């Protein structure tokens, strides 16, 4: 995973940024189609959390925005898992 | 109550999750076409499943609940895979 | 109700435009102690569902729960507008 | 890819009818040790994504991973077909 300063969703969300730096072990991005980017985030147990993005106009495709949008959805689902285990409370106390 | 749902009678896995790990499963008809199932665990964490019939004139309360519960248990299995408790269910068949 | 009541509509002119012109009805239901369901209806009665779930049940707020569920409901609705091509009509106006 | 290779199409007349009449292309990418991604495109190049993640990575199987991901992708496509009313045309042919 690269530095959190690269992703606009991490700069505007304290919660997502904290989850990204502390609880994300690896983060991979793949362009699977002309319009869609897939982001897979893993925790320390290598559990995979998936997020996707799909640009409406394929001629406006941009790797950075696609990765940032896919990562943002991936962290939305990760926060659901952190709420299930209760470890979300640990993240909230550390902001 | 598990006997009343066809998705549980046909799935040993979802029936085992329902009988042992589901605290409550409530159902609400939220619109002419859609039913919402709210599955909660013993820690009161809520898992939401929905269903929507294509033709509104075909709406059946029982089918809507069974479909939304099956979708809700699909999502709950994801949470069980995250915590590792899914292999406890797969251990007990 | 009127679009100005929702914060996500005041902060997003795309979602406000879709809500004002392409949404027939937007109803909300509290389905559980923590979750709120929003059912968005287009002029052909097709149903788009969005949900929200507050982490701390003692922090439940009706307005925030409705606003969050509506915003996610409009995210899914935009996908349907991109499928039919009506998203291009919204982006022009 | 021919529809006979997918178990989800051999078990669902609805999904197999959608795959052959309304699906232009469906590609598969293994994006991680556990997850497979399927990208279904219609004849207007609109993309519908479906994913599958095996619980035990040692049991990863390419066939099951693709079949599960395609079955998930087609479930989402049916929602788009219900929105445009095009699902009624599929029901005419099954
Ligand atoms: N399943 C599916 N959904 C689609 C498709 N085309 C558009 N959508 C949906 O419409 C929303 C708005 O599209 P937009 O292109 O006008 O704005 C896009 C676009 O402005 C930007 N974006 C995302 N990926 C991008 C990318 N790869 N390049 C440039 N911009 C991108 O993020 C915004 C929202 O991404 P999104 O994936 O969450 O939502 C899409 C997406 O959910 C599609 O072909 N298939
Ligand atoms: N977001 C959204 N999705 C819709 C809508 N209308 C249909 N869909 C989707 O089409 C799929 C197939 O609908 P079907 O009516 O032809 O078969 C339905 C229907 O035969 C049955 N079913 C579900 N709820 C029912 C109900 N309340 N009454 C009777 N039958 C019901 O389960 C099947 C699959 O439900 P589903 O929610 O998983 O998938 C829907 C659903 O995802 C809709 O208005 N909004
Ligand atoms: N399936 C499920 N997901 C949950 C549950 N509890 C939390 N989540 C997830 O974590 C987020 C809650 O964190 P937060 O409560 O601190 O911020 C919440 C909360 O600050 C606010 N919010 C939403 N509904 C609210 C409500 N009814 N009352 C007060 N605040 C609310 O919106 C934010 C994001 O809601 P969300 O639905 O998108 O994401 C949930 C949700 O995806 C849960 O019990 N079940
Ligand atoms: N977001 C996320 N979800 C996960 C992860 N690991 C498991 N899950 C979920 O648990 C469900 C049941 O896993 P299973 O491995 O015991 O059965 C799997 C498995 O028996 C089979 N399957 C799917 N992909 C496979 C594959 N690539 N190889 C072998 N079997 C596969 O399909 C079943 C259901 O797939 P699924 O993706 O819809 O649901 C998963 C999945 O939603 C994970 O790491 N991340």
Numbering used by the authors:
A (entry chain A): 2 to 96
B (entry chain D): 4 to 96
C (entry chain C): 3 to 95
D (entry chain B): 3 to 96
Original authors' sentences:
In this study, we discover Acb4 from the Bacillus phage SPO1 as the founding member of a widespread family of >1,300 anti-CBASS immune evasion proteins. We demonstrate that Acb4 is a phage-encoded sponge that sequesters CBASS signals to subvert host anti-phage defense, highlighting viral inhibition of host nucleotide immune signals as a conserved mechanism of immune evasion. CBASS operons encode two main components: a cGAS/DncV-like nucleotidyltransferase (CD-NTase) enzyme that responds to phage infection and catalyzes the synthesis of a nucleotide immune signal, and a CD-NTase-associated protein (Cap) effector that recognizes the nucleotide immune signal and induces cell death or cell stasis to prevent phage propagation. Acb4 is a small 96 amino acid protein that assembles into a tetrameric pinwheel-like structure.
To define the molecular mechanism of Acb4 nucleotide sequestration and CBASS evasion, we determined a 2.10 Å crystal structure of the phage SPO1 Acb4–3′3′-cGAMP complex (Crystallographic Statistics). Individual Acb4 protomers form two distinct protein–protein interfaces that interlock to create the tetrameric pinwheel-like assembly. Recognition of guanine occurs through Acb4 residues K36A and E49B that coordinate sequence-specific contacts with the nucleobase Watson-Crick edge. In the opposite pocket, adenine recognition occurs through peptide backbone interactions between Acb4 residue N63A and the adenine Watson-Crick edge, and an additional network of van der Waals contacts formed by residues V56A, F62A, and I66A that sterically restrict access of guanine nucleobases.
